[PDB]
Design a protein around this ligand. Structure first.
Ligand code: ROQ
Ligand code: ZN
Length: 335
């Protein structure tokens, strides 16, 4: 249920701001950083919302005005779309599938141009949607460097050390409009998802529901995204989507969601909730142990399936031949 803001300021959000879907969910635990149950969840690679990390405490003052004045004059990747879904597509892989035409268009612009183009849309009451997704780098201004240095690195660095993870891969700044949706997908890295402004509904599915979410081919630009349209699921093509069960939560300013590697997640900015701001922390997972302990975890099988598809695309000399050969291997033999 919705949490209540301090000072009797009412519920931060209500159920009417959530989109409706066909599957059931149960809540992700919201725990304190000092709760041993939170440490045992991160250790067992299960999601958890940490409410009091102070991970991005200096950034909780961030808004469009503050950022525009201090985030520098670097280039920011801004995506536009006529729909609320911002399906990710790997541009490097668009050569393999010359028939894929993205629904989102990427435009590289300055931050003040992003704010202005967002102002125009609001002014003219247009229905275009924008989503800024840019990796933080050296080009940021002094005040943002101060904020960045003010994050609680003492806490997240200990997490990195306790779990044997690799190095921090990147920090992605996310600024989207109310109603924006990032369709279900899984990342190969560990992710700490630090909410700053606004509220986001996060629906996670464990790796063992691979069969229910039907990822695109590895060589397809939408590699690691689900093929299922959550708004209009095609049960004829994707019958096991009727068996999907998610883990749900709504994160607000100060909350940090641990999204374990290979876990699916569907993210949506709450309807009529204003703009959302997020910063995520990606870490390379711990190395694969030398002695493999059976039975294999679900994510290890996903890793195996990915490698088979990759090798097959390399050996055949064309990723388009992957499907035909795989079907030839199974039809009347393993099915
Ligand atoms: C883009 C982001 C989701 C979102 O907040 O829209 C995500 O996949 C991640 O941080 O891992
Ligand atoms: Zn992700």
């Amino acid at each position: 249920e919705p949490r209540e803001e301090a000072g009797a300021l009412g519920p931060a959000w209500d159920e009417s701001q959530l989109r409706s879907y066909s599957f059931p969910t149960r809540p992700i635990p919201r725990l304190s950083q000092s709760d041993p149950r939170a440490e045992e969840l991160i250790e067992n690679e299960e999601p958890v919302v940490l409410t009091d990390t102070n991970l991005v405490y200096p950034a909780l003052k961030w808004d469009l005005e503050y950022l525009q004045e201090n985030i520098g004059n670097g280039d920011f990747s801004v995506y536009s779309a006529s729909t609320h879904k911002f399906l990710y597509y790997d541009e490097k892989k668009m050569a393999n599938f010359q028939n894929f035409k993205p629904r989102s268009n990427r435009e590289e612009m300055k931050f003040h141009e992003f704010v202005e183009k967002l102002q125009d849309i609001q002014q003219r009451g247009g229905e275009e949607r924008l989503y800024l997704q840019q990796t933080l780098n050296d080009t940021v201004g002094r005040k943002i460097v101060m904020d960045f240095l003010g994050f609680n690195w003492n806490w997240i660095n200990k997490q990195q050390g306790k779990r044997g993870w690799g190095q921090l891969t990147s920090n992605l700044l996310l600024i989207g409009m109310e109603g924006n949706v990032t369709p279900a997908h899984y990342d190969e890295q560990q992710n700490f998802f630090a909410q700053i402004k606004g509220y986001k509904r996060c629906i996670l599915f464990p790796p063992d529901q691979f069969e229910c979410l039907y990822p695109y081919p590895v060589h397809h630009p939408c590699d690691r995204q689900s093929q299922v349209d959550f708004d209009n699921p095609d049960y004829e093509r994707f019958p096991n989507f009727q068996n999907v069960v998610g883990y749900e939560t709504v994160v607000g300013p100060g909350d940090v969601l641990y999204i374990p590697m290979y876990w699916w997640h569907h993210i949506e900015s709450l309807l009529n909730g204003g703009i959302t701001i997020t910063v995520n922390f990606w870490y390379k997972g711990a190395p694969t142990p030398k002695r493999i302990e059976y039975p294999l975890k679900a994510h290890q099988k996903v890793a195996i399936m990915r490698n088979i598809e990759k090798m097959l695309g390399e050996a055949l000399g064309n990723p388009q031949e992957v499907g035909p050969l795989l079907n030839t291997m199974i039809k009347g033999r393993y099915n």
